[PDB]
Amino acid sequence: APDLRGKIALVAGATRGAGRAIAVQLGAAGATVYVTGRTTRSETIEETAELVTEAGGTGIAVPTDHLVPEQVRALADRVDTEQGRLDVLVNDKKVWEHDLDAGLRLMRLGVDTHAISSHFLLPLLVRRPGGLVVEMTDGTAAYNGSHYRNSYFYDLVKNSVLRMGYVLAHELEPYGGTAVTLTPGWMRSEMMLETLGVTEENWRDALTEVPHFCISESPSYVGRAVAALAGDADVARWNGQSVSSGQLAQEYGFTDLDGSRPDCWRYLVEVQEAGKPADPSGYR
Amino acid sequence: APDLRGKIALVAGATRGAGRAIAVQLGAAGATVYVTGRTTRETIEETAELVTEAGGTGIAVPTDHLVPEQVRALADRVDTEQGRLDVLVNDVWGEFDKKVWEHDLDAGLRLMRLGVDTHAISSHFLLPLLVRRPGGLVVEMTDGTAAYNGSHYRNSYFYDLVKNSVLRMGYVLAHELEPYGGTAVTLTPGWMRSEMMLETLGVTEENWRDALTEVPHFCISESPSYVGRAVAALAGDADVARWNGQSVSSGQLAQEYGFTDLDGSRPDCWRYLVEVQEAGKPADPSGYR
């Protein structure tokens, strides 16, 4: 397990989902984790901060509207003020049938938030060599390169975030910084679980409803992937790359909480898209 | 030369640059071209007038492509006047030395909205008429090919994201159009001798090589009409669907279709940049145009 004691991390959008689990596993590795989000006081950013500390780290919730630049500027001044450093930064319809106002808003919320974040927080990170940026997305470059993702606006956002890691990787290298774009697999998120009417303790009950859900992973999986990167002294070998939680589980050797290693994106192509029946053998 | 007589085309953002040159070469191939832009009476009307003299029909529709109501009215007009849309070209566009945190943020966000949102609004309102019948063609204009951009950082954070988003737009639209018999590609010009480029170097088109002393690698440049002839070759290709979803360049299509620039050459900008300029070799167009 990575020893991240003394490290300063910030997870933008950590109220729920991968962001919370990422912040929590960073705290479990011993880091101080700034966690941001709009929903305040549990399904709150404060609850996220409390989970980071409970895990053995220090979680500091900073409520932020990441589309409001002055709020992200204030966020960046705060980490500098309190810490003086930042080691890890974590960020059915045709196009003409889709609702246009929603699609444009989706692209602004999914892309502009990352750009505003990098503009204000990257100066502190490149202040010393060794900083790491992880841009979170849905899918790998290899998968998204040959697959349309759900909708026009969704697809554009997720592939923009893929490019953001390549772009930042070129901008950060002269400072000794690293940027990657990371995706989870099929997450057993709090939202996903309630949608299937199950708890984490009894998640395979849903396999009758969704048989291919047998490849799913807990949110802590991609959280341990980030911790492995932030603890990697030669993490710069990944600079500019698109990576997945399952790919990094094979490289670093961590497991999900249940000890398995789901490999979602190979399963989707070789089994599910291949017309084969749901069968996790050899994929977790 | 392609015979596009009877074809109805629309070029979004056709006041100048590739968009004007594309609209003109479509009219020279016989098309009726709707040309849009904000700049009216170096105007969109001038673009329409140039389409007509070239042997076609240019119809200027001043449009703010960031205002959906205006783009919807534009789409209703083509249906009202023509009832069909065969070719749609998207060329709507809005700090080369700066990091994302050094760049001006408000400008960068405005750059991404003007360069990405305008294309999405355009596809939302105009694609229904285009997919009404098979054989429609969508051309999303960009800077660079997927092969080049995949291994090259492009100018700035915001610029890079915009141009690579439009590349993805061609792939995405290719999936949405296939059941309708429609085709989408993303096309880039080379280094265009645009009106802006020519004035920046203090030259005219008639004497453009005078600039080689100050910019030697400009020897690979092309006139705007080159990429215009690439669009016309696609729109005239009965088997254009073989390109569906692909990223293409003006020089690559010159090799495939056999057209030339106005001066009879075939600049291959993106191979030249990698094999000569980025390789440290001196500027020498031999074998690249």
A216 neighbors A187 (Cβ within 8 angstroms) = yes
Query: A210 in contact with B at a CB cutoff of 8 Å?
Result: no
The angle at the Cα of B246, spanning B12 to B17, to the nearest 5 degrees, equals 30
Q: Minimal Cα–Cα distance from B169 to chain A, Å? A: 7
Q: Number of residue pairs across A and B with CB atoms under 8 Å?
A: 99
CATH entry, B8-198+224-266, from 3.50.50.60, 3.40.50.720, 1.10.10.10, 3.30.930.10? 3.40.50.720
Query: Distance (Å) from the C-alpha of residue A76 to the closest C-alpha of chain B?
Result: 12
Map residue B253 onto helix, strand or coil.
Answer: helix
Question: Does residue B96 sit at the A interface (CB-CB below 8 Å)?
Answer: no
In this structure, chain A runs to a length of: 284
Provide, as residue numbers in chain B, all residues whose Cβ is less than 8 Å from the Cβ of A168. 100, 157
Whether the CB-CB separation of B186 and B251 falls below 8 Å is answered with no
Give the single-character DSSP code of B141: E
- CA-based nearest residue to B112, from A89, A110, A36, A146: A110
CB-based contact A98:A18 (threshold 8 Å): no
Reference A272, options A194, A211, A203; nearest CA is A211
Alpha-carbon distances of B140 from A190, A280, B37, B85, B137, rounded to whole Å: 39, 41, 16, 15, 10
d(CA A183, CA A162): 9
CATH architecture assigned to A8-185+221-258: 3-Layer(aba) Sandwich (3.40)
Which residues face A53 on adjacent strands?
none
Of A115, A152, A155, the CB nearest to B108: A115
Q: Does residue B121 sit in helix, strand or coil?
A: helix
What's the one-letter identity of residue A250? Answer: Q
Resolved by: X-ray
Residue B155: its chain A contacts at CB < 8 A? none
| Nearest-CA distance B127 → chain A (Å) | 7
Residue keyed to tokens 């495939």: B256
Helices (H), B132-223: 146-149, 157-177, 195-200
Q: What are phi and psi of A218, to 5 degrees?
A: -75, 160
Chain B residue whose CA is closest to A171? B99
* Rounded Cα gap, residues A33 and A58, in angstroms: 6
C-beta atoms of B105 and A167 within 8 A: no
In angstroms, rounded to a whole number, what is the distance separating the alpha carbons of residues A262 and A255?
Answer: 9
Residues A149 and A143: their CA atoms lie apart, in Å, by: 10
Joined together, the tokens standing for residue B126 give 């105009």
Chain A contact for B168 (CB, 8 A cutoff): yes
Q: Which residues of B touch A94 (CB under 8 A)?
A: 127, 176
Report how far residue B51's alpha carbon sits from residue B58's, in angstroms, rounded to the nearest whole number.
5
**Resolution, Å (one decimal):** 2.1
Partner A contacted by B105 (CB < 8 A): yes
Which of B117, B153, B165 lies closest to A160 in CB terms?
B165
